Amino acid sequence: PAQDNSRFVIRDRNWHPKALTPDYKTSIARSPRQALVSIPQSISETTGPNFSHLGFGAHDHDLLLNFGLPIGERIIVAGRVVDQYGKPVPNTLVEMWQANAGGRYRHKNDRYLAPLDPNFGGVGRCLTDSDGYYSFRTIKPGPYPWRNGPNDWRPAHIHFGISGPSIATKLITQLYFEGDPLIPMCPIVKSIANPEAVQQLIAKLDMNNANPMDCLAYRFDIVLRGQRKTHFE
Amino acid sequence: PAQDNSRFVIRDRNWHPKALTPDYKTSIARSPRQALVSIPQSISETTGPNFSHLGFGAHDHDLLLNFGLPIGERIIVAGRVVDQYGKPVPNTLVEMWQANAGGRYRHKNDRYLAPLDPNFGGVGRCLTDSDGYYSFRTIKPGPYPWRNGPNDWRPAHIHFGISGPSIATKLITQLYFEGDPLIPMCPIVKSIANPEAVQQLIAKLDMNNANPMDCLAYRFDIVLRGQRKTHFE
Amino acid sequence: PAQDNSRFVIRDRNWHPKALTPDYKTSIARSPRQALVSIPQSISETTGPNFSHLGFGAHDHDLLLNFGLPIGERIIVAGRVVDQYGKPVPNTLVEMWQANAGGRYRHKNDRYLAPLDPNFGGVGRCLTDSDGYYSFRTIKPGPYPWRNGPNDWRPAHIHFGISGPSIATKLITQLYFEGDPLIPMCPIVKSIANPEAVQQLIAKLDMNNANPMDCLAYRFDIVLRGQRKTHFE
Amino acid sequence: PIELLPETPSQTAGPYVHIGLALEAAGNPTRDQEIWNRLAKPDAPGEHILLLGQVYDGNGHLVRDSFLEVWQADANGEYQDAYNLENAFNSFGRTATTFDAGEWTLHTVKPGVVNNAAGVPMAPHINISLFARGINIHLHTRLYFDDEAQANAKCPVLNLIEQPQRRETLIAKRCEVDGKTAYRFDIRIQGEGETVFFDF
Amino acid sequence: PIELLPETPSQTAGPYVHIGLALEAAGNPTRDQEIWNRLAKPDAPGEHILLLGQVYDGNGHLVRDSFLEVWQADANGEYQDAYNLENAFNSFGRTATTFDAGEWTLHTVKPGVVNNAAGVPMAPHINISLFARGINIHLHTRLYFDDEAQANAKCPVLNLIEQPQRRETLIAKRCEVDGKTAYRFDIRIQGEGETVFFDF
Amino acid sequence: PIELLPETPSQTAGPYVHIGLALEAAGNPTRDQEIWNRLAKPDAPGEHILLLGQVYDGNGHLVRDSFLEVWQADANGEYQDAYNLENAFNSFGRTATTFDAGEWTLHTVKPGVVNNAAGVPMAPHINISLFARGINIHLHTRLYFDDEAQANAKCPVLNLIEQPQRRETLIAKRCEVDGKTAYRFDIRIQGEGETVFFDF
Amino acid sequence: PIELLPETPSQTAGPYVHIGLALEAAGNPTRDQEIWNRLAKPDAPGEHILLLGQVYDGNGHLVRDSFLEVWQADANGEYQDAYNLENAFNSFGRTATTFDAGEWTLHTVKPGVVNNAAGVPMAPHINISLFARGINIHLHTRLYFDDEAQANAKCPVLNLIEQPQRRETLIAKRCEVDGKTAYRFDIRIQGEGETVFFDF
């Protein structure tokens, strides 16, 4: 069983998006009005599941084959998962989900007029390696309209969920593409007050990793709460 | 029949890409080694076809219907065609062609591994209106690899051909998308020495023209040789 | 035998000197006119010889003893060989050759009037260690005149040949010395378009490695093409 | 001051979180091994219980697109981190609310007591993280049991909530479903009886 | 000095120009009305002729992906600008080279004489624009006829080419195809016998 | 976009390359172990061959200061990477052009077939890199054998050269030297019959 | 991205709006022609109705300085854009809240049905814009009729409001005033029962 051997650096709630960000409409009614209650870290918060033993399929991380070939821009999305101390986070679970090349999601609730791709599901998972690296192969998603303001559009993005070493490190986020003109206009992106923080969600074109005459590649590195040993406790 | 009533401003061959631009390999053997011979304008050069009477189909300019719905980002591409004097060029022929959302063209010679879209052809045509405006509705094309350098990729683009009032104004070009990280790396884009000229080929996101919950829009204005009356000839 | 498990980052041919650099007269008739043909990497290109078993003599890397003592500025030339990812390249062959203190080469064809040095050959070889480090002990060479323009002088330099992990990495270059005023006047240096690329060829004075009361030291690190594993191939 | 690398900023999981983390729920085909709402196998030691609840927004409206993750000790108060489908018990699980009913369910055992860092025992609790469209960064909370008043009274964490009335929001009310032991734990994101959320 | 707005920069038509401007050639379905290589209807006045040619690169290799546009006066030396498929004659047309054979063909009549701006008559000619992958900006040229030496000798445009030997590159050589009057006009982009290209 | 550390820029080997890489040729004493032009020992399996050639500049003049490095599979189509003078076969060698005659020679064996990345076999070939004063960055080419036409016809690499005529520039002409099998491979850096050079 | 000229920013109408748009109410002499609260003349076709309501702030207090503008189709579901005092029906009107009672009144006819952009008919509605001190930019809402439930049920607009409960805030309660058909439409700017406001 797990043991309480580390402490995680406190989160910066001014770096992360606040709960109430009115331009993102739904957040009005879904943001707490009382202040969070801070609690000291215990074994309950400093431990979490390890997915080393989960039985992943052979194409869990390959969206081009996990669902004919899908239509759209073939790309590899890879990067490294490290903590705030720059330390790799090995054997950690990385899950992703996204729309198709037209911005249509394979979900009941998606009624957008862009069609579904008979050969595209849009779900992937990968366990990071010994060095904290992960990789996926998919197609680049299309922006999509949503009912917020009368003409709001989500910049193309890939959804990511990352476990890390504890429930204290778990995070869900969204990766955006270097240069998309839709990023600066998105109220969800704007839920993040610091422009520097936004930069952190932008995947960089990585020509070094592309497969000539096959697919392009984007690099997206992830930083989770720094992990340290307890001391003088 | 046509008459010799105007003169066109001389082209700036230092603004346009030169013939020999070695990084674009095929241009080595397809560029003339002798200098062009300048000739004074005559009725032969100052006149051209008028397509006012061509019988265009109802969806000639709509790539979403001119070929099920195609897969990919629905967009409108519109703009105005003016001359160097800022004058509109009405009733002029605008033709376009492009790949699918995956970067696959509907041509024999395209052997790229990205599949063809059963509902996408990629050819459009539109006659500009009385005010020089044109518009097309299509899906945004995907970048594609080509055999130049060992890892060259064309930034997503739409091919355009524009008639104008004379054969002196005819032009073929390529429209690129605002922010594409692939533009600065393309040897074809780079065939154009002036960075300012490149900017001219970049389509701007135009949220004003988009159809909420339907499609985005890009604005691409075209400038053809200025037209003036002869004088003291 | 060797196996095909690596891919090398595509060389940047705008970084390296172009083939045709007219100020460097000899390049005129010794540069292809047709474009290079790019081919996918195969075992043929991603493998190379390993010189680990080559039997190197005791003074192979010591030009002060491998040929009395040479006349000239006693120096140590050391550095590391890394790939573009910053990974060390251990057990790699590094070969060097240069003129003596007066810019005279110990070669038949060198009829420069500065005398040969009886205790100096001008050749060395070193296998990098586990950390990618190499070292040589020599005397600093002198610049020398050459029949290019009517008064062309090569800056002082040492020629280097590095094998790296494959024939795709093999490279030959020249090391120049920090602050030499001849540097910016050389047509061979100038074959390199980007001033930042030039900087990469300049060895820095390294007082840290110097042997007091004995010899100075210069630091020269080399970067071979980045090596990556194949993926989704 | 010393500054580390900044943590990657959170983003709402959005309305389609299910396609990524609750496949069945998305109404899409599942994979061989899925992380879901059954932490304990029939044969796992401890009192087997059923957890159910609803989530409410600030307008008192059901949130039908929530995604919850849970972490708890086993009946022995041990955290079983090595996730395996072969395990009789797994300390981690996932659930979500019905697009219809808007109710989540979880099948587990009652957690054993664990001590805080200072060596003081905390009352039995299940750590919960909630995600949904409209929530920029997930909300952390704890589920305690109404049938453990004695322990609840002495919990060092529960004791950190300033106002006693707020502590009540964290107590699941014991019930029975099909003569099976259940506990109902409703979460109120905002407004009246707003559920206590933590920062750690 | 006064500077106007800059003209949009040219870009190569690329290897797939056919899908956009030579549909049949692309091997794709055509539209109701297409602009192609038949300028004259059987019933159009003037000498009906067939034009054919090949295009060569600098290595002397056939260019099998070229696209050409043409503009010429009618038999009366009149430019018929109002393009219509109902026209017996259209002054404009389009052709392309076979991916196999690499030869283009055009069906027209021999153009009437037209005067330059100074009122001097130019020899009969067809204005041509060439496009292809590897050509950043299209090449302008003219096709003249070998059977009009007298006029050719006096053409004010032809007379602008410095070297007489270069003038020859612009003369189509009369032949006959199926006992039909034809003229062969080969274009050499680069090297030996490089075709004269204009700027206007 | 992501940018790595830039590769150290190449520089011409210069006229005196021999002093560093071809001691014998530089006419300087050699060391105990030198990497030279004998890839195979008389007892190495495979057909032993003699390879010779000349290198020409763009004026058709001999390049008497060229330096070449070769890389090839043994008879079994395997690359012997562990360089050792005791081996009966070494996949790596070096040669240079006579300051006099200006011809290089290599003593090896006809390489076995190896497959590309896609698993498609390539025709027997020898990888060559050429260095010399006037060459800012080395030239990469391959030598193919004239008596392997069937295979040459199917080579995935040779098949990448658009123009069929340029492929012939990579084919070594079989001959006999002292009743010993030889193949002559002439390299023309520029102009007429210019040898194809590769990038990878 | 393309940016147009920015729209002139809105500013509160302020407390004295009446002086400019509701002369009678401001208690100032009116001009010959004033745009007021009588949309229909007694002889206008359709069911004549009396509309009245109050406006409340977030404290539940009466807003006695509100100014309202209405836009509606006539009985035939047509918008009469040509404003004229002689018309028996005008699609446009204005009203304000009593400084005393604080109720506004309008005299019109039950609007006919009009379709949306998609051709889907909308339930009979009246477009309202509210202005007042404290309101930086005007509020847009629609008034629906309680006796049009079938239609209300199918309204493409009403159907856009996620929460069914909020739709009720747009339904005017039918009544009778002096045995004359009336409908009461109370607007709550904030808090409990807050009226839905639109953007378009």
Ligand SMILES: O=C(O)Cc1ccc(O)cc1
């Ligand atoms: O919350 C929203 O409705 C906007 C949104 C939609 C999809 C998504 O994946 C993320 C946010």
Ligand SMILES: O=C(O)Cc1ccc(O)cc1
């Ligand atoms: O000339 C080339 O091969 C590159 C290219 C490919 C397609 C295209 O549409 C434009 C240029």
Ligand SMILES: O=C(O)Cc1ccc(O)cc1
């Ligand atoms: O190419 C040349 O002749 C100049 C040169 C001379 C010596 C040397 O080592 C390098 C280049």
Ligand SMILES: O=C(O)Cc1ccc(O)cc1
């Ligand atoms: O809202 C207010 O009371 C301030 C105000 C007063 C007069 C005016 O005209 C506008 C605003």
Ligand SMILES: [Fe+3]
């Ligand atoms: Fe999304």
Ligand SMILES: [Fe+3]
């Ligand atoms: Fe293209």
Ligand SMILES: [Fe+3]
């Ligand atoms: Fe030198």
